[PDB]
Design an enzyme around this catalytic site. Sequence first.
Site, PDB file in Angstrom:
ATOM      1  N   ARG A  82       0.914   2.478  -9.850  1.00 53.59           N
ATOM      2  CA  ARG A  82       0.061   2.805  -8.716  1.00 53.59           C
ATOM      3  C   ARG A  82      -1.146   1.874  -8.638  1.00 53.59           C
ATOM      4  NH1 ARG A  82      -3.899   7.811  -7.268  1.00 53.59           N
ATOM      5  NH2 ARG A  82      -3.667   7.744  -4.982  1.00 53.59           N
TER       6      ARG A  82
ATOM      7  N   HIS B  83      -2.339  -0.238  -5.353  1.00 51.28           N
ATOM      8  CA  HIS B  83      -3.671  -0.229  -4.768  1.00 51.28           C
ATOM      9  C   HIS B  83      -4.398  -1.561  -4.916  1.00 51.28           C
ATOM     10  CE1 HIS B  83      -4.384   4.404  -4.376  1.00 51.28           C
ATOM     11  NE2 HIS B  83      -3.307   3.980  -3.742  1.00 51.28           N
ATOM     12  N   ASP B  84      -3.932  -2.422  -5.811  1.00 53.22           N
ATOM     13  CA  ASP B  84      -4.583  -3.715  -5.936  1.00 53.22           C
ATOM     14  C   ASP B  84      -4.087  -4.559  -4.774  1.00 53.22           C
ATOM     15  OD1 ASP B  84      -5.742  -6.118  -6.586  1.00 53.22           O
ATOM     16  OD2 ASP B  84      -4.313  -6.621  -8.168  1.00 53.22           O
TER      17      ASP B  84
ATOM     18  N   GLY C 289      -4.928  -8.277  -1.194  1.00 58.84           N
ATOM     19  CA  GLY C 289      -3.837  -8.837  -1.972  1.00 58.84           C
ATOM     20  C   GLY C 289      -3.938  -8.515  -3.447  1.00 58.84           C
TER      21      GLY C 289
ATOM     22  N   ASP D 245      -5.087  -9.343  -6.388  1.00 60.70           N
ATOM     23  CA  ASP D 245      -6.092 -10.235  -6.958  1.00 60.70           C
ATOM     24  C   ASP D 245      -6.964  -9.561  -8.015  1.00 60.70           C
ATOM     25  OD1 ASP D 245      -7.397  -8.417  -5.389  1.00 60.70           O
ATOM     26  OD2 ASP D 245      -8.553  -9.885  -4.245  1.00 60.70           O
TER      27      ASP D 245
ATOM     28  N   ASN E 172      -8.919   6.089  -4.482  1.00 65.09           N
ATOM     29  CA  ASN E 172      -9.005   5.824  -5.917  1.00 65.09           C
ATOM     30  C   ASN E 172      -9.865   6.807  -6.697  1.00 65.09           C
ATOM     31  OD1 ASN E 172      -7.387   3.447  -6.077  1.00 65.09           O
ATOM     32  ND2 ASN E 172      -9.082   2.255  -5.223  1.00 65.09           N
TER      33      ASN E 172
ATOM     34  N   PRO F 299      -3.201   3.825   2.330  1.00 66.21           N
ATOM     35  CA  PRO F 299      -2.646   4.929   3.115  1.00 66.21           C
ATOM     36  C   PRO F 299      -3.000   6.273   2.492  1.00 66.21           C
ATOM     37  CG  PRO F 299      -0.953   3.998   1.753  1.00 66.21           C
ATOM     38  CD  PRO F 299      -2.133   3.051   1.672  1.00 66.21           C
TER      39      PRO F 299
ATOM     40  N   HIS G 104       7.242   7.316  -6.003  1.00 69.18           N
ATOM     41  CA  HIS G 104       6.975   8.728  -6.208  1.00 69.18           C
ATOM     42  C   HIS G 104       8.141   9.434  -6.892  1.00 69.18           C
ATOM     43  CE1 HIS G 104       3.716   8.664  -2.813  1.00 69.18           C
ATOM     44  NE2 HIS G 104       3.300   8.116  -3.941  1.00 69.18           N
ATOM     45  N   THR G 105       8.982   8.655  -7.569  1.00 66.53           N
ATOM     46  CA  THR G 105      10.102   9.232  -8.306  1.00 66.53           C
ATOM     47  C   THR G 105       9.551   9.753  -9.637  1.00 66.53           C
ATOM     48  OG1 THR G 105      12.327   8.866  -9.204  1.00 66.53           O
ATOM     49  CG2 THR G 105      10.730   7.082  -9.481  1.00 66.53           C
TER      50      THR G 105
ATOM     51  N   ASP H 226       8.294  14.302  -8.283  1.00 66.49           N
ATOM     52  CA  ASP H 226       9.749  14.456  -8.287  1.00 66.49           C
ATOM     53  C   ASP H 226      10.149  15.685  -9.101  1.00 66.49           C
ATOM     54  OD1 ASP H 226      12.481  14.278  -8.484  1.00 66.49           O
ATOM     55  OD2 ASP H 226      12.512  12.265  -9.359  1.00 66.49           O
TER      56      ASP H 226
ATOM     57  N   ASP I 136      14.063   6.799 -11.067  1.00 66.76           N
ATOM     58  CA  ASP I 136      15.424   6.806 -10.548  1.00 66.76           C
ATOM     59  C   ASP I 136      15.412   7.124  -9.058  1.00 66.76           C
ATOM     60  OD1 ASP I 136      14.719   9.464 -10.524  1.00 66.76           O
ATOM     61  OD2 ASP I 136      16.016  10.015 -12.214  1.00 66.76           O
TER      62      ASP I 136
HETATM   63  C1  HEM Z   1       3.488   5.204   1.500  1.00 66.88           C
HETATM   64  C2  HEM Z   1       2.157   5.702   1.261  1.00 66.88           C
HETATM   65  C3  HEM Z   1       1.688   6.288   0.093  1.00 66.88           C
HETATM   66  C4  HEM Z   1       0.829   7.341   0.038  1.00 66.88           C
HETATM   67  C5  HEM Z   1       0.183   8.093   1.197  1.00 66.88           C
HETATM   68  C6  HEM Z   1       0.605   7.647  -1.347  1.00 66.88           C
HETATM   69  C7  HEM Z   1      -0.183   8.709  -1.812  1.00 66.88           C
HETATM   70  C8  HEM Z   1      -0.345   9.113  -3.137  1.00 66.88           C
HETATM   71  C9  HEM Z   1      -1.103  10.271  -3.558  1.00 66.88           C
HETATM   72  C10 HEM Z   1      -1.806  11.295  -2.667  1.00 66.88           C
HETATM   73  C11 HEM Z   1      -1.021  10.317  -4.910  1.00 66.88           C
HETATM   74  C12 HEM Z   1      -1.652  11.423  -5.760  1.00 66.88           C
HETATM   75  C13 HEM Z   1      -2.961  10.976  -6.383  1.00 66.88           C
HETATM   76  C14 HEM Z   1      -3.666  12.091  -7.132  1.00 66.88           C
HETATM   77  O1  HEM Z   1      -3.309  13.269  -6.932  1.00 66.88           O
HETATM   78  O2  HEM Z   1      -4.586  11.787  -7.916  1.00 66.88           O
HETATM   79  C15 HEM Z   1      -0.203   9.189  -5.323  1.00 66.88           C
HETATM   80  C16 HEM Z   1       0.232   8.941  -6.624  1.00 66.88           C
HETATM   81  C17 HEM Z   1       1.136   7.963  -7.016  1.00 66.88           C
HETATM   82  N1  HEM Z   1       1.659   7.011  -6.158  1.00 66.88           N
HETATM   83 FE1  HEM Z   1       1.583   6.950  -4.162  1.00 66.88          FE
HETATM   84  N2  HEM Z   1       1.333   6.805  -2.159  1.00 66.88           N
HETATM   85  C18 HEM Z   1       1.966   5.931  -1.299  1.00 66.88           C
HETATM   86  C19 HEM Z   1       2.700   4.830  -1.750  1.00 66.88           C
HETATM   87  C20 HEM Z   1       2.949   4.447  -3.072  1.00 66.88           C
HETATM   88  C21 HEM Z   1       3.540   3.177  -3.484  1.00 66.88           C
HETATM   89  C22 HEM Z   1       3.912   2.033  -2.534  1.00 66.88           C
HETATM   90  C23 HEM Z   1       3.596   3.206  -4.855  1.00 66.88           C
HETATM   91  C24 HEM Z   1       4.053   2.223  -5.741  1.00 66.88           C
HETATM   92  C25 HEM Z   1       5.148   1.328  -5.478  1.00 66.88           C
HETATM   93  C26 HEM Z   1       3.020   4.484  -5.250  1.00 66.88           C
HETATM   94  C27 HEM Z   1       2.993   4.990  -6.549  1.00 66.88           C
HETATM   95  C28 HEM Z   1       2.414   6.187  -6.963  1.00 66.88           C
HETATM   96  C29 HEM Z   1       2.508   6.709  -8.289  1.00 66.88           C
HETATM   97  C30 HEM Z   1       3.415   6.133  -9.371  1.00 66.88           C
HETATM   98  C31 HEM Z   1       1.697   7.802  -8.356  1.00 66.88           C
HETATM   99  C32 HEM Z   1       1.419   8.648  -9.601  1.00 66.88           C
HETATM  100  C33 HEM Z   1       0.228   8.094 -10.360  1.00 66.88           C
HETATM  101  C34 HEM Z   1      -0.196   8.951 -11.539  1.00 66.88           C
HETATM  102  O3  HEM Z   1       0.453   9.982 -11.813  1.00 66.88           O
HETATM  103  O4  HEM Z   1      -1.192   8.586 -12.193  1.00 66.88           O
HETATM  104  N3  HEM Z   1       2.570   5.198  -4.162  1.00 66.88           N
HETATM  105  N4  HEM Z   1       0.241   8.475  -4.220  1.00 66.88           N
HETATM  106 CA   LIG Z   2      -6.777  -6.315  -4.505  1.00 63.16          CA
HETATM  107 CA   LIG Z   3      12.476  10.648 -10.935  1.00 65.79          CA
END
Ligand code: HEM
Ligand SMILES: [Ca+2]
Ligand SMILES: [Ca+2]
EC number: 1.11.1.7
Length: 306
Positions: free
Chosen positions: A38, A42-43, A48, A50, A70, A139, A170-171, A222, A230
Amino acid sequence: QLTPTFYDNSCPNVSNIVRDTIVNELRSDPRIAASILRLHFHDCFVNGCDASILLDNTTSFRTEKDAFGNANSARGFPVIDRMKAAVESACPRTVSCADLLTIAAQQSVTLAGGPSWRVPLGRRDSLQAFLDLANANLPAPFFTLPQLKDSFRNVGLNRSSDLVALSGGHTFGKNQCRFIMDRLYNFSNTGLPDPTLNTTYLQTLRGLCPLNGNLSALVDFDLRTPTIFDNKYYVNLEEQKGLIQSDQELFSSPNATDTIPLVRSFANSTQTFFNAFVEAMDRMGNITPLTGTQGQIRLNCRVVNS
Ligand code: HEM
Ligand SMILES: [Ca+2]
Ligand SMILES: [Ca+2]
């Protein structure tokens, strides 16, 4: 041009050092692989990839760590510091924080059971952080599909496959109750739950996130395989079990004519998903990188070299 072999002569052991750090951390913190992926996301979505997100506050610019996407959410910064120090020991002033984080993200995905590939390298580190840009570009879970598409296109990812494949992140990982409270009790001021959320799962989530309860409580993205990388994430969407609004909209939005077939394709084949994820990951990792002599090879990821 970024290339996978960038450090094959200057620091051939970089990937292994990064992997070792994550393996070690996973023992005490099973959520770290998700957290690191994640961080890379966000980076890349802010000026970009960076390493701008790694910078701490200064009197001239605010840290992206205080961005709405963040603050009290992004984590794993100390772990990045650890691997950076280890890499600096093995190869002084060679690997950028931007590249380090990209490798960390890839290794994290693989360690969690995902695909294995060599990421393009050669990125350099920013000379500043961008808080306003982060607040604008990251987003949010309450985004509609059109807004999600807008957010990706804004940073350079035009393809629906980019959005659907990368959402597969989000898997695994965790999400705070605060982000689904509306779906559970009052969605879009209707005073009713989100109709696209499976009613059985609705009950389960309400039990984990009661009204007026601890909004910081964590729930798994998930429900099938919480910590394994997965394609189960997509199987969930097909059953209306996506956790956040932005997840389920990929399958249920009125604007999902182009994303539904992708969701189905990824749910049907792990290979199809993994291929798409690597392809999309490399595209995201190619967003406006600083290269050549632009930027620096930051020694301490938290501060610009002086
Ligand atoms: C499409 C729009 C996306 C939205 C709106 C979004 C939103 C979120 C939100 C709300 C969380 C929860 C944060 C928290 O409760 O502290 C999160 C966690 C996470 N997101 Fe997304 N996300 C998006 C795309 C992505 C992408 C592109 C990736 C990586 C390729 C990603 C990977 C993750 C991961 C792995 C977590 C878990 C992090 C942890 O448990 O520390 N997300 N995201
Ligand atoms: Ca950056
Ligand atoms: Ca999974």
